[PDB]
Amino acid sequence: YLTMTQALEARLGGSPFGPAGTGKTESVKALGHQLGRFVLVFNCDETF
Amino acid sequence: IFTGSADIKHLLPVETQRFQSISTEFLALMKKVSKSPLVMDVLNIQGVQ
Amino acid sequence: KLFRSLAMTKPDRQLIAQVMLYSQGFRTAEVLANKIVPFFKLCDEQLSSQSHYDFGLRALKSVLVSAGNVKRERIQKIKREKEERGEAVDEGEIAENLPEQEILIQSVCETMVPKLVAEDIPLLFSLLSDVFPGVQYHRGEMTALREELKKVCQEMYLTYGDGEEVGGMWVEKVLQLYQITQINHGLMMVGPSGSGKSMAWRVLLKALERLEGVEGVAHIIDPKAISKDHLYGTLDPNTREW
Amino acid sequence: MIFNNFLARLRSIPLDESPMLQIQRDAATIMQPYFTSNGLVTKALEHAFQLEHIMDLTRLRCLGSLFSMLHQACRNV
Amino acid sequence: KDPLFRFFEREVKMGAKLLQDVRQDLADVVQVCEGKKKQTNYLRTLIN
Amino acid sequence: DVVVPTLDTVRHEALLYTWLAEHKPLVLCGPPGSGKTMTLFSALRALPD
Amino acid sequence: MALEEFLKQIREVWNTYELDLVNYQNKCRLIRGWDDLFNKVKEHI
Ligand SMILES: Nc1ncnc2c1ncn2[C@@H]1O[C@H](COP(=O)(O)OP(=O)(O)OP(=O)(O)O)[C@@H](O)[C@H]1O
Ligand SMILES: Nc1ncnc2c1ncn2[C@@H]1O[C@H](COP(=O)(O)OP(=O)(O)O)[C@@H](O)[C@H]1O
Ligand SMILES: Nc1ncnc2c1ncn2[C@@H]1O[C@H](COP(=O)(O)OP(=O)(O)O)[C@@H](O)[C@H]1O
Ligand SMILES: [Mg+2]
Ligand SMILES: [Mg+2]
């Protein structure tokens, strides 16, 4: 939350990384819902 | 012709093969007729005409 | 440079287990978490290494969600059986007289057992005894489902069994597949060629259709017999149509 | 289990679509003692896994071929 | 019931499997180099 | 077209016939030029359909 | 009452009429009796 809010304040994006299963997508969604935002999840691939 | 004469085998092989296929089909349809000699059972065979 | 990167490498599994067992109504949430997280570590570091083994945060979350659901179901069953055997139902003693450890072991065995190879099951149960002493896992016998399975097997010339009889392991696998189908919306059936997977899920589908009365429809897709473009879809490079 | 499935299908499904089915039941009755645990087929299949083959040996490939040509034997009868 | 025994049985299983694999591969290689047996795709890759 | 009969040839003939008869898929494995397609085609002439 | 008799007569005739099959060199069961069958069909029409 601290890092992503710092990124938001600087008008930068947030890029949580790590091995799968550590709670990155869910953490981003939880932060977005804590601020009452509409968070859209996209499963990217080579066709994007 | 196709069975009594064995020379047509040499001279018309492909003709003999197509006639043999036709003969097997005709014999199968005739067996279907024979198991049910009733006229309407033959008439009601799927795609008989 | 347009993004701020954060490394999320080690989630705090113990705290998640503690808080999310506390919130579901478990009185011994501290002890239950301190027993269940090291148990998952032990499963990771003691069982044989298999390509279809997962003991991460997703598995722990699924186990604890199933534990909450199982506790709710057990409380409802206790209320029903007490109502049909007298009038003494109250929330207090039902909450106090409740085997939370047995519920957690039941959830673990409902989630982790179907994935195990034959030689790992004794290791898993020895680990469970070591971490949760005295607690035993007794799976309920789905009698009606088993009769439906037997009828379907007879109809389709399958060899239905029970216990140690020829075909008992296959029926056990079918029941485990049914349990995982209830728990998870994503199913994988792993096993060497011709191990009974297709017949297992077909027989389970037919048995469920005949038991619950709802028709089952199966779509079988070979994802590698066609290109990924034909498997998911194409966005037209020219007209931008889908 | 596979042997039981093969025998049940032999005794139940006619090969044409009854003399065919009666021949099938008689043949299944003859084959029954061999299609058993620790039988001729089981021991032969166990020994076949020790030989070398042009391709990797799979149990169901052998079993399917065997059932195919047993159906062919019934057709020959 | 012994965790140490579980660890050691896993270790010996993995070691025996990999040892048999390596010894069989080396035996096939030495047979190939003597001309006793022909060279297969797997043997070609291993020798290369 | 002509095939000189041989022990292996006739054995593979019988095997290919008993396999193609029920329409079971099958694969002939062997080094190039061994006679796999010759054996198959000489088995298909016994199946005119 | 006559038309029903004709309909029932046609129904019974065509429910009991069978093709006249005979053996042919132990190869087939060929049909004879063409004239009578054709006459029956034409007269019923
Ligand atoms: N319970 C059973 N009793 C009797 N026969 C069975 C049973 N399960 C499968 N079989 C038969 O054994 C064979 C196994 O086929 P099945 O579709 O079950 O395998 P599978 O595990 O899905 O295989 P694969 O992954 O190679 O496709 C089939 O011929 C099937 O009819
Ligand atoms: N702080 C947390 N509290 C509760 N659950 C969590 C937490 N972090 C992760 N999880 C659980 O872990 C699972 C996987 O997390 P996810 O964000 O999908 O992983 P990934 O980082 O690969 O996207 C989710 O089901 C989520 O519920
Ligand atoms: N028993 C046999 N009788 C006659 N010719 C044979 C016999 N065995 C092998 N041959 C010859 O060997 C050749 C096999 O080639 P082919 O069958 O095309 O190889 P592949 O089946 O691998 O494509 C044929 O041209 C055939 O003339
Ligand atoms: Mg994610
Ligand atoms: Mg399958």
- CB within 8 Å: F29 and D55: yes
Rounded to the nearest 10 degrees, the angle between the axes of helix C143-155 and helix C197-212 is 120
Question: Half-sphere exposure (CA, 13 Å, Cβ side) for B16?
Answer: 14
Separation CA E23–CA E16 (nearest Å): 10
Q: Choose among C3, C56, C232: nearest Cβ to A13.
A: C3
How far apart are the C-alpha atoms of C228 and A45, rounded to whole Å? 11
Ion ligand 5, residues whose Cβ is below 5 A away: C 198
Parallel, antiparallel, or unpaired: how do β-strands C3-7 and A13-17 relate?
A: parallel
Q: Please, are residues F39 and F16 in contact by the beta-carbon 8 Å criterion? A: yes
In total, chain G counts a number of residues equal to: 45
User: What technique solved it?
Assistant: cryo-EM
Integer Cα distance of A25 and C11 in angstroms:
13
Give the H or E element holding residue F16: helix F7-20
Q: Report yes or no: G24 at the B interface, CB cutoff 8 Å.
A: no
Q: From the centroid of its chain, how far is CA C213?
A: 23
What CA–CA distance (Å, rounded) separates C108 from C36?
9
**Residues from chain E contacting residue C126 (CB–CB below 8 Å):** 1
- F25-38 in b/e burial notation, b at 16+ Cβ within 10 A? eeeeeeeeeeebee
Distances (CA, A) of C225 to C140, C228, C229, G26: 40, 9, 12, 52
Q: Give the three-class secondary structure for G24.
A: strand
d(CA F37, CA F29): 10
**Do residues C120 and C47 touch, judged by C-beta distance below 8 A?**
yes
Q: How many CB atoms lie within 10 A of CB C33?
A: 24
Pair A6, C4: CB distance under 8 Å? yes
F11, F24, F47, best to mutate vs chain D, most D CBs in 10 Å: F24
What is the chain B residue with the closest CA to F46? Answer: B17
Q: CA-to-CA distance for A13 and C51, rounded, in angstroms?
A: 35
**How far apart are the C-alpha atoms of C156 and C153, rounded to whole Å?**
5
Residue C160: which of E12, E27, D1 has the closest Cα?
Answer: D1
Start-to-end Cα distance in chain D: 26
> For residues C131 and E46, what is the distance between their CA atoms, to the nearest angstrom?
46
Query: Which contacts of F24-27 are long-range, i.e. CB under 8 A and separated by 24 or more positions?
Result: F24/D64, F24/D65, F24/D68
Beta-carbon-side half-sphere exposure of residue C36 (alpha carbons within 13 Å): 35
Sign of CA dihedral C82, C86, C88, C90: positive
Strand partners, G30: G22
How close, in Å, is residue C9 to chain A by CA atoms? 5
What span, in angstroms and rounded, lies between the C-alpha atoms of C217 and C231? Answer: 19
Cβ pair C42, C34 in contact under 8 A:
no
Alpha helices in chain C, H assignment, sequence order: 13-22, 29-46, 57-83, 91-96, 100-112, 121-131, 143-155, 168-183, 197-212, 228-232
| B and A touching (3 or more beta-carbon pairs closer than 8 Å) | no
| Contact in structure between C27 and C100 (CB atoms under 8 Å) | yes
Closest CA to C2 of A15, D44, D33, F17: A15
D52 touches D46 (CB < 8 A): no
Distance CA G22, CA G35 (A): 16
The backbone torsions φ and ψ at residue C90, rounded to the nearest 5 degrees and listed phi first, read -155, 150
Q: If we measure between CA atoms, which residue out of G45, A47, D43 comes closest to residue C235? A: A47
CB contact under 8 Å between B30 and G14, yes or no, is no
Residue F29, both tokens: 């494995």
Residue type, C29: A
- Cα distances from C86 to residues B11, C79, C82, in angstroms, run 98, 10, 6
Cβ C111 vs Cβ C81: under 8 Å: no
Report the alpha-carbon distance of residue E22 to residue G3 in Å, rounded. 96
- Diameter over CA atoms, chain A: 33
C87 burial type by CB count under 10 A (0-12 exposed, 13-18 middle, 19+ buried): exposed
Three-state DSSP class for C170?
helix
Q: Which two tokens stand for residue C41?
A: 């570590």
Contact by Cβ (8 Å): C117, C48: yes
Tally of CB atoms within 10 A around G34? 9
∠ CA D59-D60-D64, nearest 5°, is 130
G21, G23, G17: which is closest to G41 by C-alpha? G17
Instruction: Tell me the Ramachandran region of residue C17: left when phi exceeds 0, alpha when psi lies from -120 to 50, beta otherwise.
Output: alpha
Q: Is D11 helix (H, G, I), strand (E, B) or coil?
A: helix
Return the H-helix or E-strand segment holding A17: strand A13-17
d(CA A6, CA G44) in angstroms, rounded, equals: 99
Whose CA is closest to atom 13 on ligand 2? C58
d(CA G14, CA C168): 58
Question: 3-state class of F31 per DSSP?
Answer: coil
Q: How far apart are CA D48 and CA G36, in angstroms?
A: 67
Give the amino acid at C117.
V
C-alpha dihedral over B31, B35, B37, B43, to 10 degrees? -70
